[PDB]
Design a binder for this molecule. Sequence first.
Ligand SMILES: CCCCCCCCCCCCCC(=O)OC[C@H](COP(=O)(O)OCC(O)COP(=O)(O)OC[C@@H](COC(=O)CCCCCCCCCCCCC)OC(=O)CCCCCCCCCCCCC)OC(=O)CCCCCCCCCCCCC
Ligand SMILES: CCCCCCCCCCCCCC(=O)OC[C@H](COP(=O)(O)OCC(O)COP(=O)(O)OC[C@@H](COC(=O)CCCCCCCCCCCCC)OC(=O)CCCCCCCCCCCCC)OC(=O)CCCCCCCCCCCCC
Ligand code: BCL
Ligand code: BCL
Ligand SMILES: CC[C@H]1c2cc3[nH]c4c(c3C)C(=O)[C@H](C(=O)OC)c4c3nc(cc4[nH]c(cc(n2)[C@@H]1C)c(C(C)=O)c4C)[C@@H](C)[C@@H]3CCC(=O)OC/C=C(\C)CCC[C@H](C)CCC[C@H](C)CCCC(C)C
Ligand SMILES: CC[C@H]1c2cc3[nH]c4c(c3C)C(=O)[C@H](C(=O)OC)c4c3nc(cc4[nH]c(cc(n2)[C@@H]1C)c(C(C)=O)c4C)[C@@H](C)[C@@H]3CCC(=O)OC/C=C(\C)CCC[C@H](C)CCC[C@H](C)CCCC(C)C
Ligand SMILES: CC(C)=CCC/C(C)=C/CC/C(C)=C/CC/C(C)=C/CC/C(C)=C/CC/C(C)=C/CC/C(C)=C/CC/C(C)=C/CC1=C(C)C(=O)c2ccccc2C1=O
Ligand SMILES: CC(C)=CCC/C(C)=C\CC/C(C)=C/CC/C(C)=C\CC/C(C)=C\CC/C(C)=C\CC/C(C)=C/CC/C(C)=C/CC1=C(C)C(=O)c2ccccc2C1=O
Ligand SMILES: COC(C)(C)C/C=C/C(C)=C/C=C/C(C)=C/C=C/C(C)=C/C=C\C=C(C)\C=C\C=C(C)\C=C\C=C(C)\C=C\CC(C)(C)OC
Ligand SMILES: CCCCCCCCCCCCO[C@@H]1O[C@H](CO)[C@@H](O[C@H]2O[C@H](CO)[C@@H](O)[C@H](O)[C@H]2O)[C@H](O)[C@H]1O
Ligand SMILES: [Fe+3]
Lengths: 101, 298, 60, 69, 55, 56, 335, 271, 38
Amino acid sequence: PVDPVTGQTIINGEPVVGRVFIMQKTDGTVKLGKWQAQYDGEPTAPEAANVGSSYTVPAPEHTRRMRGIMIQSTLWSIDGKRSARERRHYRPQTTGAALGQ
Amino acid sequence: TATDSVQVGYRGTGMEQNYDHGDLKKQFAQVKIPTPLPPAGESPPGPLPWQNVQVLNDISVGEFNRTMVAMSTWVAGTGNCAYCHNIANLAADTLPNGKPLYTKLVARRMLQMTRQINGQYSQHVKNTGVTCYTCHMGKPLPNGLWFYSSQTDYLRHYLDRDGARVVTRDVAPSNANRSSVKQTEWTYALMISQSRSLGVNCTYCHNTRQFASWKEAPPARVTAYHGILMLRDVNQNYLSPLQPVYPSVRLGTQGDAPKAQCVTCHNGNYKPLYGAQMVKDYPALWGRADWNGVPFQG
Amino acid sequence: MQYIDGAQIALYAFWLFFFGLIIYIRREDKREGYPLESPQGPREGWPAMPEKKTYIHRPT
Amino acid sequence: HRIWLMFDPRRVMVAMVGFLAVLALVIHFILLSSQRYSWIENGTLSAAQAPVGASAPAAAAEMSPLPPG
Amino acid sequence: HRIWLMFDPRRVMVAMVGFLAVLALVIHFILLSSQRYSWIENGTLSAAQAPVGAS
Amino acid sequence: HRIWLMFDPRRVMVAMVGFLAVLALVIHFILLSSQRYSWIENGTLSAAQAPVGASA
Amino acid sequence: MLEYQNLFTRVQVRTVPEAGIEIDESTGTRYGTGTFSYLAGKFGDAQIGPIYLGWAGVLSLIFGFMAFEIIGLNMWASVGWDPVEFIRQLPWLALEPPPPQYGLRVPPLAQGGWYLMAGFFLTISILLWWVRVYRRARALNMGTHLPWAFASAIFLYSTFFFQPLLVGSWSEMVPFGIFPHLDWTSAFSIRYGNLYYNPFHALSIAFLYGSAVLFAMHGATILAVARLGGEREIEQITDRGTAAERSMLFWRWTMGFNATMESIHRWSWWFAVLTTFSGGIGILLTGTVVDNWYLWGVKHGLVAPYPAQNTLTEEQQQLLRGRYQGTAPDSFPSY
Amino acid sequence: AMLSFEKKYRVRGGTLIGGDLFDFWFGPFYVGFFGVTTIFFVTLGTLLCVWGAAMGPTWNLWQISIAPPDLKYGLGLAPLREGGLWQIITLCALGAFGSWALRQAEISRKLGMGMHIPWAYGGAVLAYATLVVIRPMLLGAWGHGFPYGIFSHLDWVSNVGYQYLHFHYNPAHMIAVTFFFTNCLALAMHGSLILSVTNPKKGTPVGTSETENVFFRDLLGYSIGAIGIHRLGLFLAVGAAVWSAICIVISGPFWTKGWPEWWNWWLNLPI
Amino acid sequence: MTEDEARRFHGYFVTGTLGYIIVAAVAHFLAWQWRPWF
Ligand SMILES: CCCCCCCCCCCCCC(=O)OC[C@H](COP(=O)(O)OCC(O)COP(=O)(O)OC[C@@H](COC(=O)CCCCCCCCCCCCC)OC(=O)CCCCCCCCCCCCC)OC(=O)CCCCCCCCCCCCC
Ligand SMILES: CCCCCCCCCCCCCC(=O)OC[C@H](COP(=O)(O)OCC(O)COP(=O)(O)OC[C@@H](COC(=O)CCCCCCCCCCCCC)OC(=O)CCCCCCCCCCCCC)OC(=O)CCCCCCCCCCCCC
Ligand code: BCL
Ligand code: BCL
Ligand SMILES: CC[C@H]1c2cc3[nH]c4c(c3C)C(=O)[C@H](C(=O)OC)c4c3nc(cc4[nH]c(cc(n2)[C@@H]1C)c(C(C)=O)c4C)[C@@H](C)[C@@H]3CCC(=O)OC/C=C(\C)CCC[C@H](C)CCC[C@H](C)CCCC(C)C
Ligand SMILES: CC[C@H]1c2cc3[nH]c4c(c3C)C(=O)[C@H](C(=O)OC)c4c3nc(cc4[nH]c(cc(n2)[C@@H]1C)c(C(C)=O)c4C)[C@@H](C)[C@@H]3CCC(=O)OC/C=C(\C)CCC[C@H](C)CCC[C@H](C)CCCC(C)C
Ligand SMILES: CC(C)=CCC/C(C)=C/CC/C(C)=C/CC/C(C)=C/CC/C(C)=C/CC/C(C)=C/CC/C(C)=C/CC/C(C)=C/CC1=C(C)C(=O)c2ccccc2C1=O
Ligand SMILES: CC(C)=CCC/C(C)=C\CC/C(C)=C/CC/C(C)=C\CC/C(C)=C\CC/C(C)=C\CC/C(C)=C/CC/C(C)=C/CC1=C(C)C(=O)c2ccccc2C1=O
Ligand SMILES: COC(C)(C)C/C=C/C(C)=C/C=C/C(C)=C/C=C/C(C)=C/C=C\C=C(C)\C=C\C=C(C)\C=C\C=C(C)\C=C\CC(C)(C)OC
Ligand SMILES: CCCCCCCCCCCCO[C@@H]1O[C@H](CO)[C@@H](O[C@H]2O[C@H](CO)[C@@H](O)[C@H](O)[C@H]2O)[C@H](O)[C@H]1O
Ligand SMILES: [Fe+3]
């Protein structure tokens, strides 16, 4: 509360000489508590994963030869060579009977 | 070489964005915004003299031609009715021989798409919407077009995949989260692509000491999440269903319609066109009744 | 229990082993040049002096 | 001519050739990396068509090359 | 002349051959990496059709 | 001057040449990195068209 | 002008190559006679001498070469057998572990079977090399300190097999590749919540830095007293000369305490061994006892507070919740 | 106290600054002019660190963090409560490390030894100076330094590493990591070799210098010398720090994109 | 050494310095005419 006559801050019924400010630590930081309290204000837990019930084998032309997980963002995003791009997937296949040979 | 650094987190955390000064200046200089067309706000109180118009129905006539000039300069070029119309019959959806005008049908669907983006996804494009120019930049083909390649292509995160979280919300392991290190690598690749699409680094949306935390991350992360959801709408309900309209040269090797990603609008910038505001002066593209208190005539 | 977990238990086991190891290596560090020379007499820090160690030499 | 009794001409010639060659390479590469004097690509343009650096520029509205701090 | 007294001809000739080879390789590779002078792909173009730096 | 009996002329000359070369390179590069004196790109501009820093 | 820094040797002395101390040769023998390299003799010893080969060494070479061949051939097949692409893209190529849905069951040959074969052969060859190191040590009546340091290295290596077995999937193993194994390192840290807060990871980092510190200190100390015969450490240990005395006094005057010529090598041995031992413990604890090391650090008071960078509303907390990652789409939908 | 052989070595001379005033021993420590300067800087820096801990929200040893200033104060001395204290502590640390190196040089000049130890410590000093002086100066702000906190400087390292998307792809980082790993391997091998020769199979005599070379020649086919192993250890340990300084100084001042993209040059070779 | 070559070297060094300085003065005047910095 502020005294309406002298414009002075009052603390526990006593006036203070000076410009009262609320003390705080460096940049308003507060010590962390329990780990479960790290989710106060954070979004709720994510939902269960979407896992396909069945699996259909793709065509060879739609299958990657390189099984590295991060190959699309680490190499292919910066690689643009035509033949190198061609060797990224398997080639389409058939049978001798289907070719009439 | 001077480096322009922008602090995005608390001091000492290491959350900063670095830029090379020379290339940043060259890249910023080369952008050329089309000048806004002079407003047309004195049309007569008459009915619409339009035969085949199912989108621009709430718009006056003079502002209709204003929008048409803007659309031409944004997609095809100044003037140039020949890219979407035939000069003789502007209301015709088909060529004189009989073939339908696919560019005009695409432009109609994409008028609807632009209105949907500006109206239903304000949480991403706050007060700075999009026009045809943001994606097209004066050309008929935008950037970042992608098609079906393989199952583990992370761009499917913007079409039909859902869920990218891998981090456990507990100290101890359980069956609530059984993510593999490979799934973490997939998320890493997707986020590297996002970072390069906006020209930023990981700390723009993350405090990397805990990637899962939203309170320790800058507000941009929230915006980024909405940008995912918007894309999933755009790619599912507007771009993909346009498969039977395009000629075969437009589709992919599986014969599917081109789709959009973050770099389609952003083109390697934290904001499209460095945050240029263009749609505030083109009410036909708004999805709202007002942009910045400026009301929509109707 | 709840606050105690396996990582903490293993960490304190490692701390105990590391302190024992440091004690052993400091015992070895005083095999030459001890006891110290001081006006108050012979001096031994902690850990105290180890027993005398002799090597083996091949016959001539 | 008494300068050569102070410094070995062999050392001076080595340092001179090295410094002058490094300077020539650096200048040629600085010019080649520029926009006005990238002669391998744009050397056929006339002096009027050659790029010129921008003069005293104007400001911009609601457009920042840098993200907010 | 008298330079061969101050400099060994063997050393000078080896250094000169090395420098000339490196310089020729660097120039050829710079030209090959350019757009106007990528002669392996566009060498059949006439001088009016060859790419020019935009300005 | 007696300074040459106090300082080796070879040492002083080498130090002076090195310091001068580094200083000249530093000044030329500072000018090249600036906006007003980036002469390789904007050297054909007149004194009126050359950039000037703002009053900020 | 400068004092001789003992960095390089200017005058090399040659002699007949040293055949080696007489050792048992019932199961293996020495190959070569001993050649001399001048360039190698500038920095250290010059003799590229004979090498002993026995049972364990030959078996280790066979198994290791089989693993190396499997890895290389899978890398080569991944680029369509293109030698140009093989050399150009070599750092990005990998032999990848099986898919996560197989758990610990055997995978298809083209989807992780080769990986397990190569890993098994590499493991067998590493163990056989350990046997060879032990036997070479005991053939010369030496102590087995090197075998038990190599054992610590092998312990850290074997955690890359035991942790995926404990979490229950061979998909969590380290891929065979230059860049992809770095990718796995990064993704492993990210998946389990900032491995910086693993206490045993911090411990192993302390021991690795301390190994660098100790070797810099010991090498500088021995080079600084090599003018007094300090590099001959065996004799300075069994008959302490002025070089060892000065080495002790330098560090006693510097940091207040010192070691001896022999116990500084005990310090070095233990720092190097502990680097891999504590790291192996830290890896074994991840995903089995602790799934989020940042949250463990918050629980045990390791994490410094920062001001919040963002605040979320009640509807935002429900909206911003995501979904755990699932399987990739096996269909190409038409809309 | 003094070692059994210590007394004959404690003589006068060898100092760089000062004379008989600062030429004494405090306990086992030698005090010179640079010993006094080291004490001054250590005391001032440690007391300022304790004050920074007192200003912060906790006394927990792991959570204490004295952070550098904001980037907006670039190259200027920020207010004490807003990062200026970090700058003063940095000045104290620089003074203390320089004084430690010079005092070590005085000590080695007094025992007749070479000058290797101060120069070896100079590599670590150079790495630290690159972290807090050279790189922040090139980037133009003192706020590019790392905070002084046991686990907060780990957070700084993590965020700075992810500033370049994938920091593993830094070539100089790869070379420095190789140096560190090879150094640890070589240290293990050297310690094992010396201990196994001086502590052989029980019942057998102490081995000779030829046993070391014969063992390593039998195992690897090549055995570096007794002087060679110490030269190699010094080179590996110091080169690790030098290549670390190189790797951190090129990130930001010279390269601002993601490190993986830097490998374009290799994929675009004309062949 | 004989204090005469000191005078001779001083003359040579002084004239070299003076010429370098005047040539720098011409360069600065030329640059001022092209684009003044004050
Ligand atoms: C792949 C998977 C593995 C992955 C990880 C692998 C890690 C490997 C760690 C290995 C640790 C030892 C390393 C070492 O120096 O090895 C050299 C030595 C071979 O020497 P040698 O060839 O025989 O040469 C003979 C001679 O030259 C040895 O002299 P050296 O100087 O090398 O060794 C000195 C000996 C002296 O021994 C003694 O004084 C006897 C008492 C030693 C301590 C016994 C109790 C230890 C604790 C027990 C509970 C331990 C509980 C944890 O000293 C040593 O070798 C070691 C000295 C002590 C090291 C620090 C100990 C700190 C303990 C702190 C405890 C907490 C205090 C609060 O190898 C040995 O194995 C030596 C011991 C051989 C006798 C058997 C000992 C075990 C018997 C019981 C188990 C029997 C088999 C089931
Ligand atoms: C981490 C593991 C720990 C581990 C901790 C536990 C283990 C410690 C082991 C240390 C090594 C072995 C023991 C040893 O030999 O110590 C040396 C000394 C015996 O020395 P000495 O053998 O007699 O040789 C001394 C000889 O050089 C003659 O020296 P002198 O007596 O002439 O004077 C030398 C010094 C001191 O000058 C004096 O006038 C001393 C009395 C007044 C001291 C304060 C004066 C300042 C004003 C008041 C401040 C205080 C006002 C309240 O003169 C010097 O010039 C040397 C000092 C450096 C001067 C330049 C720097 C100036 C600025 C300093 C600013 C900071 C200090 C105030 O021994 C002792 O004093 C025995 C008791 C142990 C002393 C340390 C106790 C530390 C307790 C720490 C508790 C908290 C732990 C967390
Ligand atoms: C984003 C990345 C993550 C991270 C993820 C990991 C992971 C994951 C691991 C480490 C581990 C370690 N990390 Mg790291 N680490 C990060 C940040 C750091 C920083 C830093 C300045 O930021 C540092 C200094 C370190 C340092 C360290 C080391 C102390 C430790 C490994 C010791 C080691 O490998 O010895 C080298 C020794 C070995 C690899 C042992 C095996 C050697 C085998 C025996 C050799 C066989 C060779 C074979 C025969 C050769 C031929 C093969 C052919 C194909 C035939 N980390 C961040 C937080 N770190 C490891 C650890 O222990 O963690 C607790 C570990 O597994
Ligand atoms: C996501 C984070 C990134 C990453 C980002 C970075 C960044 C960012 C940096 C490194 C740097 C380093 N990284 Mg990396 N790094 C990662 C993963 C790794 C992994 C791994 C996966 O295993 C490894 C092995 C490494 C390895 C390393 C080293 C090459 C290097 C640290 C040593 C160093 O600089 O010493 C040099 C030594 C010093 C700086 C110490 C000097 C000490 C001074 C002289 C003071 C001593 C006295 C003291 C104050 C008081 C003592 C008191 C007494 C005890 C009483 N990184 C991941 C991928 N890495 C660092 C580097 O190069 O630094 C230059 C660095 O800054
Ligand atoms: C204290 C822990 C440190 C340490 C310790 C350590 N390592 C050790 C030892 C010790 C004490 C040994 O005794 C042992 C050794 O013998 O060292 C010389 C070993 C060893 N540490 C090794 C490596 C190593 N150590 C590492 C790490 C470390 N080792 C830690 C830092 C690392 C890292 C950082 O990842 C590596 C890579 C080996 C040199 C060696 C164990 C050798 C081994 O097991 O070999 C098995 C044999 C094979 C796999 C055969 C492979 C054959 C070829 C590689 C392929 C075929 C090539 C072909 C013929 C030609 C080329 C191709 C053609 C097409 C051109
Ligand atoms: C070749 C480079 C490698 C190396 C070598 C090396 N270090 C050395 C030497 C050598 C050759 C010594 O001779 C010297 C020594 O005397 O060792 C006993 C030293 C030394 N290496 C040390 C540590 C050290 N070295 C490190 C690194 C390395 N040192 C490199 C890998 C690291 C790392 C990686 O973090 C550390 C922690 C010291 C034990 C010692 C130097 C002692 C010294 O300088 O003491 C004077 C200072 C004090 C007594 C107290 C601090 C005074 C400051 C004013 C306090 C404020 C500090 C500041 C707030 C930093 C806080 C950092 C936070 C991250 C915690
Ligand atoms: C020619 C050429 C090609 C050159 C190219 C080289 C280039 C370009 C380099 C970059 C140039 C630039 C701009 C970089 C800046 C480099 C700088 C700033 C140089 C610094 C020079 C230098 C030698 C470093 C430090 C100087 C030193 C060693 C100072 C010591 C001075 C001295 C002897 C006095 C003692 C007092 C000291 C040291 C104060 C500390 C001190 C204080 C303050 C007490 O109160 C106190 C009281 C009681 C007990 C002890 C103390 C105590 O230790
Ligand atoms: C004026 C001035 C400034 C001048 C001073 C000089 C300067 C500028 C400072 C230094 C700068 C210089 C000159 C540095 C350049 C150094 C150079 C040229 C490079 C050296 C590179 C080099 C030697 C090799 C590279 C090392 C690499 C990459 C791999 C190491 C692999 C490895 C593990 C090797 C170990 C070899 C073996 C078999 C050792 C086992 C072995 C061990 C471990 C023993 O303990 C032991 C003890 C006693 C007998 C035998 C042995 C023994 O042979
Ligand atoms: C000329 O070309 C040819 C092909 C002829 C030769 C060329 C070969 C080349 C170029 C090879 C290149 C190899 C490279 C580049 C290799 C890179 C390797 C790297 C960087 C590896 C890094 C890490 C790998 C680790 C840590 C792997 C660890 C694996 C473990 C621990 C696996 C254990 C597996 C076991 C024990 C399997 C057991 C079998 C079971 C019991 C499961 O059986 C069912
Ligand atoms: C695969 C590529 C090749 C990898 C191997 C490269 C080998 C050479 C690099 C390692 C050695 C570099 O050599 C390095 O030289 C510099 C001079 O520039 C020395 O000097 C450097 O550190 C000292 C230490 O205080 C500073 O005073 C000095 O200003 C600084 O330049 C280093 O002490 C030495 O380590
Ligand atoms: Fe040694």
